[PDB]
Design a protein around this ligand. Structure first.
Ligand code: PLM
Ligand code: PLM
Ligand code: PLM
Ligand code: MYR
Ligand code: MYR
Ligand code: MYR
Lengths: 273, 238, 251, 58, 273, 273, 60, 58, 60, 58
């Protein structure tokens, strides 16, 4: 139970003990409760902190990217790819970046939707579409065409999905070579310090490839795949201040300097806000 | 019937799933198993076997048996280099086509210690001492023997025992490394120098050959199966 | 010491004063087929002395530009004494082999030979559309020579040594039971091969199913005035040979 | 091998069952009820005990 | 547990024992560990070899062939067939051919996709399609037309599948007449050695036949069936060197001679690569 | 276990016992094993006869008939019917007719496919189709129109099925009035021997009726229903020689006289074949 | 209801499958079994019976 | 009422579970493993024992 | 097979659901866990830490 | 007849259940956790023991 502390009863005091006075220079955060500076009653508090655990705070499916691929292409060149990262969206990036290190398993979900395009190819009666998402780990052979040999997926994991059914989902374990995923890296990739500086040094997760398994029909069609990440079995280390400035790039922490807060009229205006 | 709710992933074909399916041939009676020699249960039993390394894989030698032959000869100077290549069993062309490197290219991560055996295939009247060195990354590759002896090395004395092993210990900051070339997971450099000269009597050949073998130690391991960049195909074989 | 060794099979013996060791297959010594592994019902023949003995093949001459040689078995023994005779009169057969390759030098000579036994060594033809003819694959008691360049011929074998006729890396052949003759170290190499196959017995005339390759990785070398004729002799002995399916002789 | 745990219910005035189907531990569901708390790392990282009623500095 | 060996602690040495010196001529691979040629610390290694087992290395669905059949045909002659083999694709062929003998059960999966063809048959409103894959073992009656009597499948195993649903899957046991599947065969089919030489001698697995169970509608349609093999319950014998040269044929091991590796500038260039 | 007999070891013999000589006139089939006429070794045979049981030999789904019905009809007269029999197909008829009597339960499966017909009724957008198969036992009221009252199925068993889903299947018990199904009958129906002679005398199983439950749309459509029988829980009696001549009729065993086998050149030609 | 995931092979008709299906005739009372002579349990009992061979199967 | 039987496995170097759902015995699955054999009905239907080694007729 | 009835919510993707799914990388051996300083189990451990307040957050 | 096995979990700081549904042993799922190792066949196939510290050849 993540149950909060009960409030203890306290009467009047007159003594030498000084619970309200302290030294904030020590770095210690004072442990004063309301029962130290006023007469309190007894409250049996049944409120729990079950919802602010790092598992519950992070275990929400979040879209991290979407891309489009067509059925006609040239020549072709009608397929999609995504170099996997967690830093191309603002919402999930800010939650993961409240910590310096994290270890977790992922629940990966896809939402594939197809759209008819403007044309004059009437009449069109197209059978159901089947999509193939292939994951190529770092170093493996990359698809160059929409029908190249790499789609055989002899060893590369792939999921086949037909439209109209439940969105596909699979679990990924914790796969980093380090003991924890790094949200932040304060070094370079090369020993002489030339080259990439920052968290992009450790981004070697791989790439996803998408295509239609169907042969292209006469009517033009564009499909968009939305990737959703869900952290599972989480462990976080070294919390840090939440991002205040708006993100600019995915590879670095570059920002435009921002005010500390919203300003108000004067030091005593109660209209806040 | 039993009330049930369908969840995401239904009717999906994931190529790495473990499910039970019906047999198209019910009650089939398979042939009795036989005790065949050479059963393999792990791919690491193949990587732990010695295989010759083409250290001399220069532009003309690569299409010949001279790729494996490392030339050593009698010199007039002191401390010369014999060979040198980086510790990249998955990406370096000196290693990625051996039994160890061919198995690594199916995987994304490796870890463990490597062995480098050297056989001296010269005469019995020839004698030499060689300095087999390994240097972790962080500084450049050594360019003289004085800089190679600062690292991990073994001084090899040729004699009745023709071979010598340089064990490349696992010294990294991570637990695993990437099979592909990556600056974060650099491995270091393997170099060989002359600790002395190849001294030979009269009527003997001053030029000799040395052979390299590479195999994994008992702490070697791989991870995250992938496809190889070594085999390709344009259309179906008829 | 451990460099000396003797092997007595039948009325034959081989002594070696400079060897390395015996490589025994995959740790399996050859044995006779058991009742629970057998499927042929007739009582097999076991000559056991007249056939399980040493046979010496035709010698080759190691030269400074020799890419290598290969033999097919038991096609190499198909005309060797009573072992070849039992092969002709029987439909099925089964044996293991002791292989002894012997090459001596002068202690001023240098060179390293790889001696390996490749099970199921299927070889490719020089013309991609065709198939290698019967003689290019196995000349019987005579060695077929590797080439140090691309082969040509409609029925020829692709005998470029860099792929060993099989389309693999020649340096990776050490996955099979192998040994090395290094002239400064030892003058012989011996391998004991058990019977390896997907069936308990097979026809000895339309299947091998292992090849013996001898590939010099370090070329032969010597200074002028030394002996220039360095031959390599091969002496094989079938072990635990048994036969099933007696009928008229052939092939 | 079925695990019967207590559901999340209200206080001041109820089990579910779980079976694992897959061979990998990552295929399991989230640890929604791992209630552990050690705020002393960040709020009292000082070397000495620093009692509340006492003065922080002499 | 396929747990790797721990590293033992070792201090300085000065003795007659020579762990680093050996004879590679013996064929024995030296068992030297790092603790024999340097002072090592003690490392409790928790890395496991669970992913390099032959079951995990081979238990991946791989496409082995795809073929197309139409609905109109002539006359017809609108159906598909595949003589079963594992040697028409490069990726799965090279994995299976790292061993000389293998025994396993298969998980067979199909991915059938239909495409609309160019025409002027507007307007088209076609009901859902149903496909029938029939397996004819060696010796059985072959389909000659798309509606011949053999499709009755009185004894021949067949799977019927309607589009829009999960891809069909069934298990096949180990079915060879030998004690193991052969990846390599170094003999002929005939005793006089005339005829087929090599692994094609043992290829007698059978044939698959595909068709539309529906009668053809006015609008033209072409369907493609992708077959996927998954080895199960694997046992491998006699590993051999991986294929270095690119495959050319399915029946034989014919190759074009290839270099041993990628070349580099000289014997000391560290740019590898 | 249907495990075959082990081979016993036998050495040389010289005695009066004559295992090879017998009298075939007795009707007794000799029980000679190979160990009676030659020196045999000992073989532990692990082969089993699990696949030649009559259950496994017969428990395969087989198509026994298919018929077509339309949606427009006149007037109508757009529905299908089948008088149930097992003798209208060659493949399943020959397997069932290897025995004289059989008792079994059936697994009945249907495969219904619809086809668009040639017309000029553009444009067509037709909702999903629903089919109703009704079984009328002997004596019950027959459907005369596609919308007659008999389709109410108050007591007659019927299955309703919508396209795009799994093919419908139901089990039927052993329903004959005799103690066994007869494949062969060597009598007449009437006592005076006039009328039907043969197995048609006992064919009183009933009839199946098929229709579209939907009202007909403007676009023409033809549906075909394939019936599949699967014998279950089988018991067979009195095996008889397999049919050699090709069938001609469903009601009788009438045939065209056929040769005993394929001929060859002479009495010693080994080219067979 | 019970959370479940559909796997490949759903809604497929494999002609050699062993599943249970509902009976279209519930509670039907089958005829009592009878002891008929010549019951066959295996097809190998038929192959083990002698049959004449047409060895002289020449053209005429 | 669940029946655990032995699956069909190979010899010379494994259970499944079954539950019946329907009220009729015909709704069950096939008896794939009913291994019984009595070839003597058809191969030795004679009245006398007819031992093998003995002559069939005196 | 087992007779089952589909209920509302089938084939729906609710972003806050707890289900089990298959692993795309079977038998993967994760890196051994390490004792890193500063592990956080609850977000309330972060809110309980002092932080400076911009009380004088006027316009300039 | 349900088999409870241990899932694949991490080391240095968890069961699943299995039921077989089909009558054939080939219908089962893969043997993902058959961890056996005998490298001595290929790395030390020699006849004599060949101790490490000793010289290979006298
Ligand atoms: C068929 C689908 C398989 C897809 C497998 C995707 C595996 C990629 C790894 C995802 C985890 C990345 C987490 C990085 C965290 C960070 O950088 O902060
Ligand atoms: C209705 C679908 C039934 C299909 C059944 C297919 C059975 C064919 C056999 C597949 C196994 C072939 C493996 C051969 C291995 C090799 O040659 O190396
Ligand atoms: C709604 C579907 C119900 C259909 C019920 C069909 C029952 C008909 C009886 C089928 C068994 C006929 C077997 C006869 C065997 C023979 O004549 O040899
Ligand atoms: C999420 C609720 C799951 C309900 C249970 C369905 C799964 C089958 C349970 C089988 C219980 C016996 C297995 C065991 O011994 O642990
Ligand atoms: C085909 C495998 C079926 C697996 C089991 C699912 C059906 C429910 C089993 C319930 C077991 C208890 C019933 C009983 O007492 O016999
Ligand atoms: C993959 C997880 C399967 C969960 C269990 C569902 C199947 C029914 C289990 C029935 C357990 C009792 C059968 C038995 O006695 O072994």
């Amino acid at each position: 139970i993540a149950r909060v502390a009960d409030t203890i009863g306290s009467g009047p005091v007159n003594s030498e003990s000084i619970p309200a006075l302290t030294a904030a220079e020590t770095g210690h955060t004072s442990q004063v409760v309301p029962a130290d500076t006023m007469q309190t009653r007894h409250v049996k508090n049944y409120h729990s902190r079950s919802e602010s655990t790092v598992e519950n705070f992070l275990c929400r499916s979040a879209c991290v990217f979407y891309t489009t691929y067509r059925n006609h292409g040239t020549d072709g060149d009608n397929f999609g790819y995504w170099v996997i990262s967690t830093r191309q969206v603002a919402q999930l990036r800010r939650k993961l970046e409240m910590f310096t290190y994290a270890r977790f398993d992922l629940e990966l979900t896809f939402v594939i939707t197809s759209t008819q395009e403007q044309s004059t190819i009437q009449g069109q009666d197209s059978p159901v579409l089947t999509h193939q998402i292939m994951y190529v780990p770092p170093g493996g052979p990359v698809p160059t065409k929409v029908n190249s040999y790499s789609w055989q997926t002899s060893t590369n994991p792939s999921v086949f999905w037909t439209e109209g059914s439940a969105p596909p989902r699979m679990s990924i374990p914790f796969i980093s070579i380090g003991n924890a995923y790094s949200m932040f890296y304060d070094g370079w990739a090369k020993f002489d310090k030339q080259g990439t500086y920052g968290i992009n040094t450790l981004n070697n997760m791989g790439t996803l490839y998408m295509r239609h398994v169907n042969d292209g029909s006469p009517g033009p069609i564009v499909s968009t795949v939305r990737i959703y990440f869900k952290p599972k079995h989480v462990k976080t280390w070294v919390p840090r201040p939440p991002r205040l400035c708006q993100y600019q790039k995915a590879g670095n922490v570059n920002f435009e300097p921002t005010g500390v807060t919203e300003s108000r009229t004067d030091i005593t205006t109660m209209q806040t806000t | 019937g039993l009330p049930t709710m369908l969840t995401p992933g239904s009717n999906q074909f994931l190529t790495s799933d473990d499910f039970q399916s019906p047999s198209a041939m019910p009650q089939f009676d398979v042939t009795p198993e036989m005790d065949i020699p050479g059963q393999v249960n792990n791919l690491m039993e193949i990587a732990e076997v010695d295989s010759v390394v083409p250290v001399n894989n220069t532009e003309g030698k690569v299409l010949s048996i001279e790729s494996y032959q490392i030339p050593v000869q009698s010199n007039s100077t002191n401390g010369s280099q014999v060979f040198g290549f980086p510790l990249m069993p998955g990406a370096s062309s000196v290693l990625n086509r051996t039994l160890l490197g061919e198995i690594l290219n199916y995987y994304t991560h490796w870890s463990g210690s490597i062995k480098l055996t050297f056989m001296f295939c010269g005469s019995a009247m020839a004698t030499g001492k060689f300095l087999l060195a390994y240097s972790p990354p962080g500084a450049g590759a050594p360019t003289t023997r004085k800089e190679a002896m600062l690292g991990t090395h073994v001084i090899w004395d040729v004699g009745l025992q023709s071979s010598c092993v340089l064990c490349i210990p696992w010294i990294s900051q991570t637990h695993y490394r990437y099979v592909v070339v990556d600056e974060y997971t650099a491995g270091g450099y393997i170099t060989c120098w002359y600790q002395t000269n190849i001294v030979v009597p009269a009527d003997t050949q001053s030029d000799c050959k040395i052979l390299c073998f590479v195999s994994a130690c008992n702490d070697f391991s791989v991870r995250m199966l992938k496809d190889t960049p070594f085999i390709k195909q344009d259309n179906f074989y008829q | 010491s451990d460099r000396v060794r003797s092997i007595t099979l039948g009325n034959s013996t081989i002594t070696t004063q400079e060897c390395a060791n015996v490589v025994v297959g995959y740790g399996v010594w050859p044995t006779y087929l058991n009742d629970d592994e057998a499927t042929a019902e007739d009582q097999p023949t076991q000559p056991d002395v007249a056939t399980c003995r040493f046979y010496t093949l035709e010698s080759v001459m190691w030269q400074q530009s020799s890419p290598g040689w290969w033999w097919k078995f038991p096609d190499a023994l198909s005309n060797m004494g009573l072992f070849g005779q039992n092969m002709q009169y029987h439909y099925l057969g089964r044996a293991g082999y002791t292989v002894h390759v012997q090459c001596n030098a002068s202690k001023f000579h240098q060179g390293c030979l790889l001696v390996v036994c490749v099970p199921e060594a299927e070889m490719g033809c020089a013309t991609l559309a065709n198939k290698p003819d019967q003689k290019s694959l196995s000349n019987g008691e005579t060695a077929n020579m590797f080439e140090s360049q691309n082969s040509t011929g409609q029925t020829a074998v692709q005998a470029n040594v860099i792929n060993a006729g099989m389309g693999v890396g020649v340096g990776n052949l050490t996955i099979f039971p192998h040994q090395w003759i290094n002239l400064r170290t030892n003058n012989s190499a011996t391998i004991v091969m058990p019977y390896i196959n997907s069936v308990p017995m097979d026809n000895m005339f339309r299947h091998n199913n292992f090849t013996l390759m001898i590939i010099p990785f370090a070329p032969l070398s010597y200074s002028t005035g030394a002996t220039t004729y360095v031959p390599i002799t091969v002496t094989v002995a079938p072990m635990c040979a048994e036969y099933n399916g007696l009928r008229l002789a052939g092939k | 091998g079925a695990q019967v745990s207590t559901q999340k219910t209200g206080a001041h005035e109820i089990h579910y069952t779980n079976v694992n189907y897959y061979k990998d531990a990552a295929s399991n569901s989230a640890n929604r009820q791992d209630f552990t708390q050690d705020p002393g790392k960040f709020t009292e990282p000082v070397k000495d005990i620093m009692i509340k009623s006492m003065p922080a500095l002499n």
